[PDB]
Design a protein around this ligand. Structure first.
Ligand SMILES: *[C@@H]1O[C@H](CO)[C@@H](O[C@@H]2O[C@H](CO)[C@@H](O)[C@H](O)[C@H]2NC(C)=O)[C@H](O)[C@H]1NC(C)=O
Ligand SMILES: *[C@@H]1O[C@H](CO)[C@@H](O[C@@H]2O[C@H](CO)[C@@H](O)[C@H](O)[C@H]2NC(C)=O)[C@H](O)[C@H]1NC(C)=O
Ligand SMILES: *[C@@H]1O[C@H](CO)[C@@H](O[C@@H]2O[C@H](CO)[C@@H](O)[C@H](O)[C@H]2NC(C)=O)[C@H](O)[C@H]1NC(C)=O
Ligand SMILES: *[C@@H]1O[C@H](CO)[C@@H](O[C@@H]2O[C@H](CO)[C@@H](O)[C@H](O)[C@H]2NC(C)=O)[C@H](O)[C@H]1NC(C)=O
Ligand SMILES: *[C@@H]1O[C@H](CO)[C@@H](O)[C@H](O)[C@H]1NC(C)=O
Ligand SMILES: *[C@@H]1O[C@H](CO)[C@@H](O)[C@H](O)[C@H]1NC(C)=O
Ligand SMILES: *[C@@H]1O[C@H](CO)[C@@H](O)[C@H](O)[C@H]1NC(C)=O
Lengths: 217, 48, 226, 76, 49
């Protein structure tokens, strides 16, 4: 989980909807309402900051080249699909289809639309595929994906000859693992349970709040 | 002055140390307040 | 050159701090968020909460204990709720500040007392070192990092054929300026003659995809030939 | 007198500009405002950053030939 | 916010680099990671050896 719904609740109309007598009586408490509004506003700005910190980690919007020659590694299912109206990957669209009032309760739209978060993820993925870790430290340095994989094998203490002599076996294993990721996401909802929990825990709370308008006290 | 006393100024009752104030009230002004609206200065009824 | 770059970067840090207040905005936010809360708390002493007067002493002076009791109960309920709100918000803000202080302690341990391989944990680029500075209710880390600057294109090959043997770089990569093959370190262009001391042999030419033909210098051969 | 309908609501007194810039004042669902140009407040779809294709190839490597020493400030 | 800070750290140390931290980037020896957007969250595909 990165962010939650930016809900704002007008204290005055929730407590004293369209009533001047009730508003005048609520004025006897002082800044109760203003500080609740301030807390919820802080929460919403914090949600925008959360999304910005997670995704806006790249200074430039990188492209994968039109020729996808990545030494046999197939990124077609994580790279953006232009056919879809939203420029999301196959796996991103699988993820978005698995995660499923008027009493001073408003929902503020997030600062970054799902399209802009998709463009951030596309830029990060393209930078990783075309330049390795170089784009994270400075300018993006193009390097063949096989040689980046050899760099990473050296990183985990295996000689790069092990990659180069077993390159296509490794490409096939990676492709099969991505296919299994698709199969897991296409048939198991509970996989994204964590995100769903957040979407539930907010909504339940909101329900409870509105239900308290029906109590006599 | 300069002693923690209980004071009553024209019905304003409070416990505090009364010191000579450099605050120069406008002639119509009787009390003074802080940023928090607590009584900060008072005007002696007997002598201005 | 590196000493001059470091000195210029410290000078730019001075210039940034001497002309931009919002730089220390984060610390200021804390100083604001506490003070605002305190203000709110004191302002709640001026509220009636349904009593005849917000001033407690103006109730006792004007009412008998049986009647003053109800107004004092109203004031007590209101002020108790205000103080509870203040304490709860301060507990949550203290949790936030403790998380920030734990991050600052981890950065002091892993960033000032050592060199961090963690990416972006110690700022833009490859972390070289960090210097701590005290700030009002906080810490300021000057992260000295290495950023590669002037990039150049080269042709590259995963390996090289010499005599049916596949040569791989011991460390670095094979780069061609267009006619000649060298082996260089990955983070800085320092081309070197490809020798058997620069490379290691593994299997033959058939397995590697993208292998190229070249000569691998043998440092012994000129000496042994004599 | 500009009235512009956004997904965040109704924006009055801001001129809609087709150009995309870095976000200055966050309004809502991809929409930011800024004071520009004569001077006026404009609303625009925020720009995520410079759009750059990496010169990827199966035998092309970009190697640094120099460096810079960067001192950056982190405040906690 | 704690979850989002962890996600930002994983994006920095796991997508923008190769992590030596054990199990920070999933089962095995971390090779690389790929981010994917999800409703109010992030999904990391950790490629490990
Ligand atoms: C990467 O994998 C995708 C499938 O995951 C490949 O696309 C398939 O291509 C075959 C024939 O080429 C078609 O019969 C399938 O219908 C395609 N499936 C999808 C989902 O598009 C793609 O060709 C692979 N990339 C490469 C370069 O081989
Ligand atoms: C690639 O680098 C090689 C080695 O530095 C260059 O070859 C040298 O070129 C200079 C003149 O430019 C000659 O004086 C040397 O004798 C050459 N060395 C050898 C071993 O022959 C080569 O010119 C460079 N090519 C390009 C396109 O830059
Ligand atoms: C590298 O050199 C080898 C031999 O030194 C080349 O292999 C020859 O390839 C041609 C064309 O396919 C064949 O007709 C020969 O029989 C091969 N000879 C041997 C000994 O294998 C190879 O083509 C060269 N590679 C490049 C890229 O130039
Ligand atoms: C690496 O970059 C530095 C500066 O970042 C270069 O040094 C500069 O050289 C120019 C002349 O070419 C001078 O006018 C500057 O004053 C120098 N700057 C500093 C900070 O000393 C250096 O020449 C570059 N080296 C290479 C090999 O490209
Ligand atoms: C490398 O070549 C590509 C060719 O498209 C070019 O765009 C790029 O600027 C070159 N890089 C450098 C550092 O010269
Ligand atoms: C690299 O790509 C080119 C296309 O520009 C192709 O002709 C060549 O066979 C490729 N080499 C390898 C080793 O895949
Ligand atoms: C942006 O350009 C389009 C033409 O493609 C035009 O229809 C539209 O009115 C322009 N928007 C503004 C705010 O001028």
């Amino acid at each position: 989980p990165v962010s939650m719904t930016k809900t704002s609740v007008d204290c005055t109309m929730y407590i004293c909807g369209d009533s001047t007598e009730c508003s005048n009586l609520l004025l006897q408490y002082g800044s109760f309402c203003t500080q609740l509004n301030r807390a919820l506003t802080g929460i919403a700005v914090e949600q925008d900051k959360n999304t910005q910190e997670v995704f806006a980690q790249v200074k430039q919007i990188y492209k994968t080249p039109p020729i996808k020659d990545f030494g046999g590694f197939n990124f077609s299912q994580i790279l953006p699909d232009p056919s879809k109206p939203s420029k999301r990957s196959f796996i991103e669209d699988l993820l978005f289809n698995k995660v499923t009032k008027f009493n001073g309760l408003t929902v503020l739209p997030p600062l970054l639309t799902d399209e802009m978060i998709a463009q951030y993820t596309s830029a990060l993925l393209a930078g990783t595929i075309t330049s390795g870790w170089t784009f994270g430290a400075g300018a993006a340095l193009q390097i063949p994906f096989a040689m980046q994989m050899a760099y990473r094998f050296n990183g985990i203490g295996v000689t790069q000859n092990v990659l180069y002599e077993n390159q296509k076996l490794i490409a096939n294993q990676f492709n099969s693992a991505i296919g299994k990721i698709q199969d897991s996401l296409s048939s198991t909802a509970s996989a994204l349970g964590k995100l769903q929990d957040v979407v539930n825990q907010n909504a339940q709370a909101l329900n409870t709040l509105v239900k308290q308008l029906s109590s006599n006290f | 002055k300069n002693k923690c006393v209980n004071f009553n100024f024209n019905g304003l009752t409070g416990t505090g140390v009364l010191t000579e104030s450099n605050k120069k009230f406008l002639p119509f002004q009787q009390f003074g307040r802080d940023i928090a609206d607590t009584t900060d200065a008072v005007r002696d009824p007997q002598t201005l | 050159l590196i000493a001059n770059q470091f000195n210029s970067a410290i000078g730019k840090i001075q210039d940034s701090l001497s002309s931009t207040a919002s730089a220390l905005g984060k610390l200021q936010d804390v100083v604001n968020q506490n003070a605002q809360a305190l203000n709110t708390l004191v302002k709640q002493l001026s509220s009636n909460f349904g009593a005849i007067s917000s001033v407690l002493n103006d109730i006792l002076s004007r009412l008998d204990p049986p009647e003053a009791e109800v107004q004092i109960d109203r004031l007590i309920t209101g002020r108790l709720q205000s103080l509870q709100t203040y304490v709860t918000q301060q507990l949550i803000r203290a949790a936030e500040i403790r998380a920030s202080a734990n991050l600052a302690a981890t950065k002091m341990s892993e960033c000032v007392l050592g060199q961090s391989k963690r990416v972006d944990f110690c700022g833009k680029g490859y972390h070289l070192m960090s210097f701590p500075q005290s700030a009002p209710h906080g810490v300021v880390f000057l992260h000295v990092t290495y950023v590669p600057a002037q990039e150049k294109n080269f042709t590259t090959a995963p390996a090289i054929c010499h005599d049916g043997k596949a040569h791989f770089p011991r460390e670095g990569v094979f780069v061609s300026n267009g006619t000649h093959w060298f082996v260089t370190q990955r983070n800085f262009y320092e081309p070197q003659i490809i020798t058997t001391d620069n490379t290691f042999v593994s299997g033959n030419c058939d397995v590697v995809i993208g292998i190229v033909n070249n000569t691998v210098y043998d440092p012994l051969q000129p000496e042994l030939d004599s | 007198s500009n009235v512009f309908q956004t997904r965040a609501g109704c924006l009055i007194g801001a001129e809609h500009v087709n150009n995309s810039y870095e976000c200055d004042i966050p309004i809502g669902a991809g929409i930011c405002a800024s004071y520009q140009t004569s001077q006026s407040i404009i609303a625009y779809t925020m720009s995520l950053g410079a759009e750059n294709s990496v010169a990827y190839s199966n035998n092309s490597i970009a190697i640094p030939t120099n460096f810079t020493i960067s001192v950056t400030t982190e405040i906690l």
